[PDB]
Nucleic acid binder design. Structure first.
Lengths: 84, 113
RNA sequence: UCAGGGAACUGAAACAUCUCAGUACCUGAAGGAGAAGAAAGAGAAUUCGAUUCCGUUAGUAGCGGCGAGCGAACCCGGAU
RNA sequence: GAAACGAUGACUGAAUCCGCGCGGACCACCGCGCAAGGCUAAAUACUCCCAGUGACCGAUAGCGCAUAGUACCGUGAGGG
RNA sequence: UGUUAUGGCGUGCCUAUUGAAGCAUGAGCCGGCGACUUAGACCUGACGUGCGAGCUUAAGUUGAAAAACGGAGGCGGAGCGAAAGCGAGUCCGAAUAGGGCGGCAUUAGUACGUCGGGCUAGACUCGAAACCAGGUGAGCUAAGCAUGACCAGGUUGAAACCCCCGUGACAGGGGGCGGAGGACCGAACCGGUGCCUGCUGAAACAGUCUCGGAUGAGUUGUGUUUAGGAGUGAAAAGCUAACCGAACCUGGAGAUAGCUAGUUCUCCCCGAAAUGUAUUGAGGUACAGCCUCGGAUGUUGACCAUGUCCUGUAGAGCACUCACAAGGCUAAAACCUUAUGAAACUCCGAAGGGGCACGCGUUUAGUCCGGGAGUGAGGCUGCGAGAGCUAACUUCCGUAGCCGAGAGGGAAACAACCCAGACCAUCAGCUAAGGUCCCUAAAUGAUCGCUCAGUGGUUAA
RNA sequence: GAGUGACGAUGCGCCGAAAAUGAUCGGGGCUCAAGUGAUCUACCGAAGCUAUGGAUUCAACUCGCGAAGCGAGUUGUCUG
RNA sequence: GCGACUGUUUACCAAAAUCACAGCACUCUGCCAACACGAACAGUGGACGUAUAGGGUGUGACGCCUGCCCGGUGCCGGAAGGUCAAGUGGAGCGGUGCAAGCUGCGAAAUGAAGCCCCGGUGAACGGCGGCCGUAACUAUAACGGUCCUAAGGUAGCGAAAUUCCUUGUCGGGUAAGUUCCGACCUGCACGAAAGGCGUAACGAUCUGGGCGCUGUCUCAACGAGGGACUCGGUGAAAUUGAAUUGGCUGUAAAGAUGCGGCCUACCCGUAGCAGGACGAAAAGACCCCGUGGAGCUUUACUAUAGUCUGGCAUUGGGAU
RNA sequence: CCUGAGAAACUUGGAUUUCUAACCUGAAAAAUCACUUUCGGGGACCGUGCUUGGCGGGUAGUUUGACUGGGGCGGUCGCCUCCCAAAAUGUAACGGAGGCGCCCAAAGGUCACCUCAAGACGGUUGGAAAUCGUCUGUAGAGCGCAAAGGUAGAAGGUGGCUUGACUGCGAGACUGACACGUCGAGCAGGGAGGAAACUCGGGCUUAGUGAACCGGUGGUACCGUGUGGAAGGGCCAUCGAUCAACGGAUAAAAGUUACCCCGGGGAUAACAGGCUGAUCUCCCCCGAGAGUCCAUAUCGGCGGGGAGGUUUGGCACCUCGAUGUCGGCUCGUCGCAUCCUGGGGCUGAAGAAGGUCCCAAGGGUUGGGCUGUUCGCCCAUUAAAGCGGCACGCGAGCUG
RNA sequence: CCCCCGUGCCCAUAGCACUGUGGAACCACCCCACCCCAUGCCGAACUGGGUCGUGAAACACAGCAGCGCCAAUGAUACUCGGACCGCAGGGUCCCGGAAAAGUCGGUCAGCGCGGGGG
């Protein structure tokens, strides 16, 4: 036993594997159930023919063409133009 | 933790040195030196320096045990033992350095006349 | 060859478990060979038939800190 | 380990013909066989000793030695 | 040819390494010996032959001369499930979603052989400290025991003993006498203090000279008993036949050896890695990354363009956040003017970069299956950051080139830098870097000035 | 008394500048510069490129033979 | 200074402040003793002993002495109570078959030593502090609150070597003393049977001083004898990449005869010196590494010799 | 039958006690054992055999992690947040800050509905804050906990019903080296909430976690070694590990070696060298100020620019099949920042004795006490009694 | 031609704010509310049943450049790449790319469907 501490305070070690980022970009022929962009907040909202997952995962609702749309920050929707 | 003992050591130390440095001035009656009556007076000064040396050693043989027997209770590892030594030395040696330096001036006055 | 007694590195990239092994060494007994030998047996299509040996069965069934790794027997050809 | 049967060291201590053992906890049933008495080349194992052969050697190889367990080290086991 | 003088250029081999002539390892020289095998009806594959459904085991017979029969078994010959079991289908489940397989570009192959490899055994070769079993001896030194042996000389002077003193007497003191002694001095003897010598000795432990004991717990002879993970031990882990914290000899295996060293004939082709992850792991190894070989494929690779999407290093900047420069002003926060900083601020924000389809100047890779690898800390340098006096020929990420396994020229010398990647041969030519007075080649060349320090040849306020 | 005085910017340079076995730009030397800013040209100088000859690796294109295969010309390679 | 003394040891680096001792102490053992050697209810040593005798431990002439604390540990003692082993023994749950009967699971009570729990025992292990404060001629000693708990130093000594802190501070001998002897006391970390303090004699013990003498020295000089040197005779070794094996300044894996540049230099010895050859000699005996090894220790893991213990036997017969 | 007595049957358990032909043990004639014998003595205890639990380092066999700008002490090792970057992904450092080893019987599901922080003017047991009200209000607040993203049509604040905080499944993707891990449209079975389209397979997302083995407990009637069950086994489900050194040896393991031994290392320390130079040493710049007056005779705050490398050290590159470590004694020698001498300038220099700075290494620089010392104090002197190099010069020279 | 009502695209070169023009048609207030249904408390909201009056106020059109919002020639930062410099901090040269901000300017919208009115 003691009267101080089991370990020295003031740390700065031990990081975490991160990720996230974009998987599919504009001009991509994805298939129904294809991950587009991963995130945690709301950087890219779902567009026409696109759904949102639990941790906000824009996936392809159907086969088409991945297209990005922006109105100048604030919110960026991602629609998919089906072929034929 | 050394930043805590350093103060407690310097404060108590300088507090004594600053005290004796003022008490020695109470011994000088005036001029000092009246036919052979110069060395006999120095005897009183020897006591001031003698008590000073001990006072400087006490804090060293008192504050050390407060940490030595403290880092053994599974709180502080080694590499700090010698670190604490070089910490009290800069205070002990400095103190004695001021004592001898002060006595050098005092003796130059008690024998001046 | 049989019996009595019977390791440890080493393996498990430790290790007591197991492994190395009932190996080594010692000892008792015997011979030209022995041990064993005529089934309260294996084992099962209600089959075979003293004991030993070879091949296969099978590195299967199974044993295991079920890890390492150890690992039959019946049936089937054969010496006899 | 659910783990039977054999095997004894300590204890206990059946039956003996509508009997007993066995057949994998155990039971029924069906099934298989009779212990506690004994003997038995052979086909198996080895290689001191011999004879023959060897894509075996050929004298710093082959046994250690073309002739010694001598010379020599060791109190000795033993080594050589 | 042999030999030679003079010129040039010219840092052993090897191992080990980020880097070797290395003042790092190894080796006196020659000679010869001396290290990646053997085995299993093993597994998996490459080449090959025989069948193409393929093949024997043990054994049995010929037994100067040779191969045959042996068809027990073994590999093919659908699968799926945990299993019952069902089946060109079977499990999940009372559903029609998927996994396994079949059909489709259709091999089913098997046996013998050679060759890469894997596994199990000494299993590339050499080397332990140690462990266990049995055995060897106390003719070592440690001690016990039985029985004997020995101690020149000299000194000291015990108790006890006669006697004596003033004194009844009991304790003392004296003279005589006696001979005590883990007593003294001391030779032999025993043991070792101190110095020197010796230190490839005279000698594997000693000599001279000193010193200690020298009737003693003494020295000693003979015989003799205890044993060596145990004895013995006036105790150091001392001693147990001259290196004993566990003897020595022989066997258990040539223990293990993830560590070290070495590994032998030539040429041709390719050509690595020092990264990531996990690790009682951090010089170790697994998987991938990277290499090669071959079978399928046969332009999807590769750079360069074009359009398209995502970041939000550099910069910036204030109206967000944390700090911040001067005054105002208010009862200081705020609000104002002027002015700011910022990896972890940001309403702005590029370069370049990254995904994609697309093609040409292009171009000649890419990939899938499968055999065999090695590497698994890497080093410097510019650039972009952390650490750290933005100190280290410092360390730790990213990135490019070189080294590493690339010589050649250049930087006097010099893995790193600069120019360049060496198939062979040429007393042949053009260049790159860099240079062109002489030591080596090449203008002690031109023009305009700067210089005068001999600067040019380690620095600043 | 047809010239001066104060700075501000840069090109060059002086001081600042002290090391331990003897000194030096590699050395000799170099200002009648072989120092240096800009200008041009010539030459030198790698095993780079080039020339004559040859050998090796991979591909396709004319071959011969019934075949494995050989040798032949062409481009590249020959990555060291 | 250390120890009392003579005595012993680390055969080949340590003979001593070691050990040993005479002396003191705690304890154990009366049985075929404790105890020890032994595969053994065999044998023997303890002892042809027998308790002021025998083993164990520690301590160690002799002298004044031998404090406070048993909480924890161990040691003996107690004992209605709490947990437990094998076993005895009673309800129960399940399996099979027709049934007799035949077989698994587990069970209240009860079941030895031990363990807890209580007492004691310190010449048994052992302990005798942490936080803040300082004032008082001469005489010893330090206080007062806050505390885990059981305490928290009585005598004596206190820089001996124990005192880190400077040589601590006066004092003594010296021309001058980081030493040594007296003292002070602030003992980082004295001290009572891991004994305190002291002690005449002894010590190839350690420490300091003085006397005497001296080549230890200021400085050596000289002489001698044994090599060394020369000739005849016999003739070894460690070492050894190979060698026609300079100096400086610079480089290079950062200490170059061998690279560069500069300078020096005829060829070969013999005495002789030791600077370099990172000179030899032992694959550094210090470090780091290897889930390498070994001795040793222990309240680390686990068996186990041994020893305690209930039941079962060779172990029956009577009375309550 | 139900209670109690009386009995030569026996008679399990069991305490005492008693005896004894076993057994043990002692004298005598042939004193080891054995006949026998008076005996005696103990005793059917002991001892011995099996077995239960204990005590058990007396012996035996082992364990005692790693990273680790040498080891050790310490700290730290699994997860998520930022930051650190060569700008998508990714990425090291015992690099800069911070959290987890939960929580929610419902902040979950579905459906309805509510405009936050904060200031300002004016009112209350209020005179800081809140509360009520009204203006303002790119939301500056909130979101259970860490940071970030997200930031209002809401996840944000309330209510009803509800409990999909679901079984049977997953086209195709994210990510990983492997094993994990994440996201998911659509299918079915059956349900929940709206009127409906619809949403719904936990929670605004990211941590709140753990392989495998071994075993607990419910469901299922696949095996079950002759058939028939059963024991045991298998599958669904789920529980258990503070395995926390968290990809995780055993069911279970601490120290010490100066008695040390073997295999290796200069991919790791101490000596020395080297790089370096913070620290050390010293030179120079600025002038606060002292110095009567005066800044520089001398001294120079505060702050600064370099130098040398003799100090602490950092890094650790040749050297651990061996670069012998302090000091002294011996031999020296070299540099200057010159202690003494030698020449100079300035002085606050009258002389004299100094100061200081400049130039200047020819040569010189004592004897002792203490100390093991280098170093330092002291004694007695001197022209003076210098500083530092040379593997802290010198052990194939000595001492030790 | 206009205007009102809804509902879209667009998501501040459309926003706020000074003021005005507008109510006939549409639009809101207002009126009442036992009960459907409804407020933590109020029918302000939600909402049932409905005039006149009104159009300060919510709305709707419109003007004005206060402020917001957007915002380019030049030019500098940075800079791929190419070539160097200083002991270093750090710095430049050549070819392209090349934004923050601030300067000019530009605005307070533009494009539909639908139903209702003169």
């Amino acid at each position: 036993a003691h009267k101080k501490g089991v370990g020295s305070s003031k740390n700065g070690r031990d990081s975490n594997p991160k990720y996230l980022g974009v998987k599919k970009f504009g001009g991509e022929v994805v298939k129904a159930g294809n991950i587009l962009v991963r995130q945690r907040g709301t950087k890219f909202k779902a567009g026409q023919g696109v759904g949102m997952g639990r941790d906000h995962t824009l996936f392809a609702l159907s086969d088409g063409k991945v297209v990005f749309i922006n109105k100048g920050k604030g919110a960026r929707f991602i629609s998919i133009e089906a072929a034929q | 933790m050394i930043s805590d003992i350093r103060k407690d050591a310097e404060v108590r130390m300088d507090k004594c040195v600053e005290a004796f440095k003022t008490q020695i001035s109470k011994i000088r009656t005036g001029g000092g030196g009246t036919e052979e009556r110069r060395k006999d007076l120095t005897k009183i000064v020897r006591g001031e320096a003698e008590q000073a040396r001990v006072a400087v050693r006490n804090v060293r043989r008192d504050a050390n045990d407060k940490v030595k027997a403290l880092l053994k209770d599974k709180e502080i590892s080694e590499d700090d033992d010698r670190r604490s030594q070089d910490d009290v030395q800069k205070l002990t040696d400095a103190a004695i350095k001021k004592i001898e330096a002060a006595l050098a001036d005092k003796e130059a006055e008690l024998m001046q006349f």
